């Protein structure tokens, strides 16, 4: 298989984040109204892959950076975590299975339709019948 596809490969960074986090936990969790933003399904279900990316980007790009202003004292701890989280993200987008699956099917389809001597216009029009079945079949699936 591929290493950046094995979760075993994310264990130490997962641990670093959790160890750096433990040190500053009492500060970051002071105000804390006791509400939940990231509940227990947030990243589950068919499209969790989509939510997982959104979240990670939101933190690397908005939350953490904004964090430097609200907690000037923890800037170091904050950067360390963003850094490690960044490390994890770069590795996660290197494994298809870790992201959403649609991106893979769309990719395999466009490649066949493009390795055709006519860019696949012929096979495409040739399969309008199959397409109409997939489509009707689809409408009935949900």
């Amino acid at each position: 298989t591929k290493p950046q596809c094995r979760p075993e490969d994310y264990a130490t960074r997962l641990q670093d984040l959790r160890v750096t986090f433990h040190r500053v936990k009492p500060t970051l969790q002071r105000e804390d109204d006791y509400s939940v933003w990231l509940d227990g399904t947030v990243v589950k279900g068919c499209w969790g892959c989509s939510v997982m990316d959104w979240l990670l980007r939101r933190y690397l790009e908005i939350v953490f950076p904004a964090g430097d202003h609200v907690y000037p004292g923890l800037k170091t701890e904050l950067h360390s975590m963003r850094s490690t989280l960044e490390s994890i993200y770069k590795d996660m987008r290197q494994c298809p299975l870790l992201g959403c699956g649609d991106k893979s099917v769309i990719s395999r389809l466009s490649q066949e339709a493009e390795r055709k001597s006519d860019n696949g216009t012929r096979k495409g029009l040739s399969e309008l019948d199959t397409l109409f079945s997939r489509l009707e079949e689809y409408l009935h699936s949900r």
Binding site: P7, E8, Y10, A11, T12, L14, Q15, R18, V19, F21, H22, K25, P26, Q29, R30, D32, D33, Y34, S35, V36, L38, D39, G40
Partner: protein
């Protein structure tokens, strides 16, 4: 009126399905003075007193935090009460969750076979733990253990050996004597601290 000093601090000290709440005493505590322990679960802004008047410095919140390993954590608070007087609440300073649970191992079974010491780590099986919520179930991946071995006719010096399974082997390459081992659990991806188990020994020779 009603302004008793509040408990200096409140914190959890927990192990697998053994969620114990601790707090310091209030200066000048009397004999008619008790403590009220309330519990709040993240996701539902509401406190519920578990105990109205507890004459102790700790309280077992396990029966009321069973879904800790399937939740978003709890918050806790304790306040002193003396008849009609009572202080402000003192609340935990962090969200209590699986993260703050200390890893412990139930027991280690040693055995000898053809120059091998075969060990079996028995993870904790607390009675309060609901059937399908086993240590293995909850900490499903990367369970690891630090093994410290010491030879009895040796001394108080230890040699390390890390393993990734609840079963392990140490070879007795033609050695004699008694071997004692201690086990320290952890989860390679987590930060939970763990505690050394009571030393266990076994004799090679007829001992």
């Amino acid at each position: 009126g009603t302004e008793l000093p509040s408990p200096p601090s409140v914190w959890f000290e927990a192990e697998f399905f053994h969620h114990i709440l601790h707090w310091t005493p209030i200066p000048q505590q009397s004999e008619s003075t008790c403590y009220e322990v309330a519990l709040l679960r993240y996701g539902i802004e509401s406190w519920n007193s578990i105990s109205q008047c507890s004459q102790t410095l700790s309280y077992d919140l396990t029966a009321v935090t069973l879904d800790l390993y399937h939740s978003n954590g709890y918050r806790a608070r304790v306040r002193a009460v003396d008849g009609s007087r009572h202080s402000q609440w003192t609340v935990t300073n962090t969200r209590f969750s699986v993260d703050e649970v200390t890893l412990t191992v139930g027991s280690v079974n040693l055995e000898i076979h053809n120059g091998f010491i075969l060990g079996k780590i028995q993870l904790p099986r607390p009675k309060m733990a609901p059937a399908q919520d086993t240590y293995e179930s909850i900490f499903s991946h990367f369970r690891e253990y630090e093994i410290a071995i010491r030879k009895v006719p040796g001394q108080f010096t230890f040699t390390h050996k890390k393993v990734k399974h609840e079963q392990f082997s140490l070879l007795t390459s033609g050695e004699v004597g008694e071997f004692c081992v201690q086990v320290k659990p952890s989860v390679a991806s987590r930060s939970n601290k763990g505690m050394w188990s009571k030393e266990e020994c076994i004799s090679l020779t007829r001992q």
